[PDB]
Every structure is written in C-alpha cells, then in structure tokens.
Symmetry: C3
Subunit: 329 residues, 3 copies
Amino acid sequence: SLPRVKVDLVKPPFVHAHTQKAEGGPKVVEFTLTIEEKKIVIDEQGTELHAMTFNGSVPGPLMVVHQDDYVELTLINPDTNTLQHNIDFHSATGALGGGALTVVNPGDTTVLRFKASKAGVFVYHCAPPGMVPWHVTSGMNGAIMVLPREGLTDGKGNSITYDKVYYVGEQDFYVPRDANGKFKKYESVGEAYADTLEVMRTLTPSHIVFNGAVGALTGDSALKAAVGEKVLIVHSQANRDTRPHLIGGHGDYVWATGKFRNAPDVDQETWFIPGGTAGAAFYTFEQPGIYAYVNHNLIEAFELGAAAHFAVTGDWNDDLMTSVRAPSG
Amino acid sequence: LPRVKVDLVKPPFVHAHTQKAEGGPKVVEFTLTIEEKKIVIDEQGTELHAMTFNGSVPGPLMVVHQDDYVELTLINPDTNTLQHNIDFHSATGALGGGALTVVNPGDTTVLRFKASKAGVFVYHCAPPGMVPWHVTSGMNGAIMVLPREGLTDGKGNSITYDKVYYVGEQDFYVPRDANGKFKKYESVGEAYADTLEVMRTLTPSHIVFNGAVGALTGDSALKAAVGEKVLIVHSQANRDTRPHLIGGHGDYVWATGKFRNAPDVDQETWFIPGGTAGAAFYTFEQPGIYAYVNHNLIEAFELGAAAHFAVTGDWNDDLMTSVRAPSG
Amino acid sequence: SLPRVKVDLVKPPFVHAHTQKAEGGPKVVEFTLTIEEKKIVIDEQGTELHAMTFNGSVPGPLMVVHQDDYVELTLINPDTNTLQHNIDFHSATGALGGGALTVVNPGDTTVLRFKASKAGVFVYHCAPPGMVPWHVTSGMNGAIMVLPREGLTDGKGNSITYDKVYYVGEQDFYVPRDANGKFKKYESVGEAYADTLEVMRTLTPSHIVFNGAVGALTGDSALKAAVGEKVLIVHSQANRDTRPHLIGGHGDYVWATGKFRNAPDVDQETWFIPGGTAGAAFYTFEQPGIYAYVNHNLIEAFELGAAAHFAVTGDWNDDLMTSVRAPS
Ligand SMILES: [Cu+2]
Ligand SMILES: [Cu+2]
Ligand SMILES: [Cu+2]
Ligand SMILES: [Cu+2]
Ligand SMILES: [Cu+2]
Ligand SMILES: [Cu+2]
C-alpha cells in the first residue's frame, strides 16, 4: 500500500536518475539484476578471465534509495550460466544480508525485500556457500547508496548538494601464470578454479583495476568535471584494502567508513577504505586540467592498473599555483 | 587500597565483572602461567609449537576499571625451554612491563601498573631478539579498562551490554617441505630457522579465531537472542583485520579501541590495525545463523578467519522478507 | 608583494627553525631542494641501493609554513645525475600537485609557487611520467607541515604547545636477490630497473626502515627527550601502510589522517597512517629510560628494520609502574 517506483539501472561509473532530498514519504523501490558469466579482457596485453557479473559489468551497478525506503530486488540466473549464485546486501539486517534467501541455480529467479533502515554507502556481493571469495574476486560485487531523507550534511549543521556523482568500483583479480610468466586461458569457468585458488592463497593480486580493466576510466572514458562543480566519488572494494587519492586535489568531505550519520573528515590528501566497505568523498574543483585518481600504493596504481583520470574545463587560478621559472638550463 | 583476586576463564568467555565500578580504586590480582605446547590448528591435522599465557590462544581477557591498579604474577615453569615476559599497551614505562618481567624456566615475577587510560589494549610477550616469533606463536591477549561509570554513546547517554565476547585473531607462519605438506618438529627450538623464513614473506599459512579453523563454529558458536545487547572485543597483536557481522552491523564501534573517543555508528565493516584491540556494540533484531569474518574473504574462508553466531527469537518480516522463493 | 623569508633546511629527523603561532600576516617562504642520486648502505650486512634523494637524505627534509602562506620552491637537478625528476605536493591544488610544471632533466632548474590553503602534515614525492613507483620507493619522498596560524589545539578549543618536533620518514625498499638469497649489486642505477620492477610486483619489500637504514635512529642516533617534555612525532609513508606504536608510551593526541582542523583521537596505543599520507602524534613523557618506536607489524619492525629508540632522562614514577618482585 506504499507508492511503488521502478529504477532503470545504468553501467558504471554513471548513476541512475535520483533526487538528493526525498520527494514524499517512504517508497518501495523495484530493481532487477540479471547474472551474466562471461570472458572479459582486463589489460593491454590481452589477458582474459571468466568474470561473474551482475548486469554485465564489473563492478555491478550503483542502486540509490533514501533511508526507510524498502528495496525490492528481482535476481535472475539465466539457464546459459553454469554456476549457483546469490546476493548479500551489507545495508540489510538478517539471513546473511539476503544470502540465505536468494540461492538461485541456472534457470531460477528470486525476489527479496528489505528495509533500508541505515543511511550510508554499502557493498553488495555474491556469497554462495563454499565458494565465496572466488565469486567476489571474479567481479561479482557492487554498491548501494542510501541517502538521508533530507540529503547530505557537512556533519556541522549545514546542508550540502553535489552537482554529479560517479561510482568507482575497485577489483583485485588473481590470474594464474605458467613457467614463462604469461597469463593462462581456460575453455570453461570451471577449469580456472583450482589454479585460481593457488594464487588467492598467496594474497597477491595479478591485477587491481577500476571499472573492470587497466585504463577503463582514461582516454575517451575519463570522468568529466568543471571548475566550481561539486562532485561526489563513491568508491567500493568488496575484498581488499585501498587508499584513494585525487592527484592535484583533496577530499573536502570524506566518509571513509561510508556512513553519513557520522561527521566527515575534512581537508583529506589520502583516505582509507577497508576491504568489505564503500566510502564517499565530496570535492569542489578549483583548477582545470588532467587529474589522476589512484590507489596511493603506487605499485598497485601504475604497475597493476588502479588508476583513473579526470578531464576538467575552466580557467587557471594563478593565486593557487604558478610556475615562476619554467624548467630550463 | 582494597584487594580483589580474579578467576580467569578460556576465551571467548570473560571473567565475572561489573560495567560500573563499586567503591573507589582497587588493586586487582591476576596470575598467568606460561605454557609451551603442541596444538592442532586445522582439519588436515597441521601442528604448531604454540607459546601461550594460561594455555590458550589467545590469552584470557583481563577486566578492570580506569585508575584501578593491576598486580600480575607471571609464572614460567621449569618444563618450558624458553625465556618469556609480558608487555601491556595499557601500561606506562619499561616497554609496557617487558623490561621488568624477563622470566627464564623456573622463574616467577610480580608487576604492578596503574590503569590510567580507558579502552581495550593488546598484551603480548616481547623477549629481546625473539619478539615477532613469540607473538605469531599465539603469546598475546587483551585487557579491558572500562570507565568508572561504564560505557556511553559519546553523547551523554549510558549504554549497557547483556554479554561480552573476546575474539583473538592469530596469524600463524607454518613451514612446508618441497611437496607443499606442513612440517612437524620434535622440539620448539628446531622450528625457528624455517619459521623465520616464512615470516620474512609476510604471508601467513593460517589466520584463525581462538586458536584454530572452526574454533567458534558448530557446538562452539557464540549464543545470542533477538533484543540482546552484545559487546565484541577483537584483538590482533601483529596484522591488520577488518571485522564484519554477516546480516548485522556495528551500532556503536570504537575501531581504535579507546572509549573516551566518540564511537562510529551504523558500521558495515570496521578496521583494527596490527597492534590494537577494538570493540563493537550490537543489538540483534533478527534470528538465525550469522557469520563474523575478517572481510578479506580469502583470509576468512581459505585461511580460517571465520566464526558463527546462533541467535534465537522471532523473524521480523518488516526488516526482510522473501517475496518469491528461488525457482524456475 | 607580501614579505619574503628564506629557510635553511636540516637533515631529518630534526626540523628547521619555525614558530608554532605565525608572527604577522601571510609570507612567501623560499626553500631550495637539490636532487642527488647516490649509493647508500641500508642494513648491517652492507646491502647497497641506488637511492634517489631530495637534498641527499632519505627521507627528504621536513618543510614548515603556516596556513595561507605561499611556498616558493627552487628545484635543482645537477648535470652529475642521470634521470628526469619533478615534485608533487599533496598540500597544493592543481597540475598533479606541481608534478606537471616541475619536470627537470639533468642540468635543469625550475621554480614553483603554491598557496598552502589547508592545515596539516602532507607527503611530497617525485612523480615522473611512466617511472612514479620506482622513484618514490628509491627514497624520493619527504613531507611538509602547514601549521594553523594560531598553532595546534585539542578538539575542544584549548591551545597546545610542543617543546620538540621530530620527523620519521618510513621507507619500503625492493632490492633484488639471487636464488641462494644474497642481495644483488649494480654498476649504474639504470641496470637495477628491470630486476627491481619484478620485486615491486610481488608487493613484498626486502626492507622497511626509518631515516634510510636499519638502526638509523638507535644508539648514538636515538631521539632524545626528558620526563615532562611535550613531543610531536610527524610520520610519513608515501607508498605503503604503517601502524606506529611507542613501546611504553601512548598517543595523547593523534591526527591519524594528518589534517589539524579535525579533532584528534585520544589515548591511542597504535595509530594507522595509510600509504600516501603523513600523520602526527603528540605525547608528554611520564617515565624515563629506553623507549622503542615501531611499526606494530613486529615482523616489519624487528626482522625488516622499521624500529627506532628514544633515550629519556628523568625520575622513575613508582605509582605508574613498579616491580613488586624481580625475576628469580
Ligand atoms: Cu556468484
Ligand atoms: Cu560482505
Ligand atoms: Cu614468550
Ligand atoms: Cu606491542
Ligand atoms: Cu625522481
Ligand atoms: Cu602522491
């Protein structure tokens, strides 16, 4: 008897249409995710792997509701998938975040409803009994943002409004190599398992990437902004620690634990998001040009793939920075 | 000052205590007996020469109130082969006690320190030149120094737990032969050279709660009920961890473990760096099996950092309901 | 046309002459950094490394200004060096922290000016296109302290003053090793690249050191303090997580993210500084003797080299800690 609404999800790093401030009282918000197992290319050398996805993407798409809305998820495992799957929302209470009520085999479908009682950004991930880390570290994870009914505060009594929100999902991949050091291909997802478990046990990723590949958020695919634009960056990591840093920027407000009822940290150079968490950072760009957004373990960033770009339009501010004498003899 | 003697218990249970103090400061007396012994740590029967306080991994949780004094009798029997001591993160001076408590086999020592600062703190062995070997062999525990007036939400309002559990997370470094089988050794001394080589790689063979894979599952699950308020103390002497309660949250969390600081609320996952104790306070609102993990899920499901909760009571349809159950 | 000042920089762990409170309005503060490539010895076994340094030290020297002052840096790359270099300030806004405006080949010089518009400690590092991690993990990093114009405060409005500030740069090195396990040597810095890149890809450092070498801040080089002295410890790590602990001590006030407008954590046993960050801990010594300052992954500390000593003079306090019975 509550008013129902239907969300059309979009591929990251973009986010579906939503309001910051809620319009009316509680809604039931309907989402559908279709599980897809498939081969993807994750680097410039052509390295491929059998990814396990929600809605065809790594990471899974960002779901947005407000506090005390109800989420109603349709989860679909088409008969062309080979494996069992489910979904665990960190935003929900009971039955392993819904893991225990959503076990779906190839050909099956389920529907889960939970109250979003708590404001913040949370991880969702697959967690099928006896093969949890294999599904999560194959790209079967995403995030949900639950906004306060009255939108965001600076935790010091003042309302704040973003112009745009991007979702950056970070993925640790564990691809086996042969004697030479070349990455290996496998005919089916099943045949990759034993060799993949050997690599996971070393706790050393082969690749760490944003939006499912080395360079996925650079070139044509760089994140667009402008001087004076307020931008919110949601960052998730289902399995492993990371330390985001905007090169040439700061985090004006950062919820590192990702929970908006807590006052944010201010003036951040680098922030910390533990494995199993989603964080968020609010920034106002003050300087045009190319910016890098990285994991500031710089081997993880520049060797293993954990690096994106922003392209920012606008006028240079000489007061903030100026070259007095350019490099020369 | 008045004197009290405490009877310590095996983790994850905690000795009798009160949240609020009764009367003024006390000298609280504890005894720990060092015990070197063989323990099994996984279901393939892997063995390890553990080094323990009171014969458990981790050591027992000690409980006092702020500005009480701790008087510790540390006994190293003549059946142990090694030199030992204790360092308390709760104490001020002499490497936390380390430099006043060096006991060889057959020796006894008594340390007294004032518990000036409120919070949960790591205690561990730290013998000159052998520090990480003893600590990663299980020789560590924790101490909870409660505020005289019990716990608050950092907003003036007192909060009261029904039950407290201590979870000790241990990283172990067991050597292998050329086959990839774990090695056994006749004495503890013979394990050193090979153990120091695995530690150099910073990759544990096992990460466990309460001394072994499966230690806090099945019969040994942690018991709770819908409406019960529970405090979970979690310690790691050597390596970072990220606790998560699967199907739950942390309503009040002290990630750094020091109660004069205002807690974080509505937490999914929280962060305890190596060399720290933390505490999370939760009220259960749903029944069933919960998992409590280190949310590096490779560390949890493959290396052994996983516990279960069994929770009794009535299911709440408003919070979560299966609309259509899984089928074609 | 504000007033100009010139700074003379010192070798860490010491810090150049500064005031906690600003004397007057905004200034333009001039610093000079001369890049130097050279061989250094990082352990007691004479392991050598081709280091990449700002002003010939690892870390580089601590720069100190006040909020809303301007930093004017002259960066010199002499013709005796072989590589391209530059500088990125985490404290600056635009052009990759200054990295895109400061690219100096051997024989080149550049001058950069930025407003220090935000209070805190911040990392500075070399970041040349396609060579970033190699330069940073070769020791080409330091930090800058942008003090608030009114000096440091606790959270709750009250002013706090240190008698001494020390700077601890933590460096993760990745030195290649041949099958037997002996550390390799190279004729030039360019010959070490290919083999160093392979060690880096394992994310496993060969060494972790304070002030450029195992035991660089022990013995004659121990940090000096006295009972009653207030000490600020700035700690940076440009690449990798660390978890500092003062063994026998605490952090009375900690800014773990290193940004002073945020309220500090109190009564910390162990604090956490993520890779790419500077943090700061304020402590008043209560007890004399030898203290250890460590990264509390004790493998990283005692086996890999992340360990320093304080020498503290003064009177022992029996109240805080006493030996009732000595080991026998
Ligand atoms: Cu799955
Ligand atoms: Cu999870
Ligand atoms: Cu011991
Ligand atoms: Cu310690
Ligand atoms: Cu350089
Ligand atoms: Cu940087």
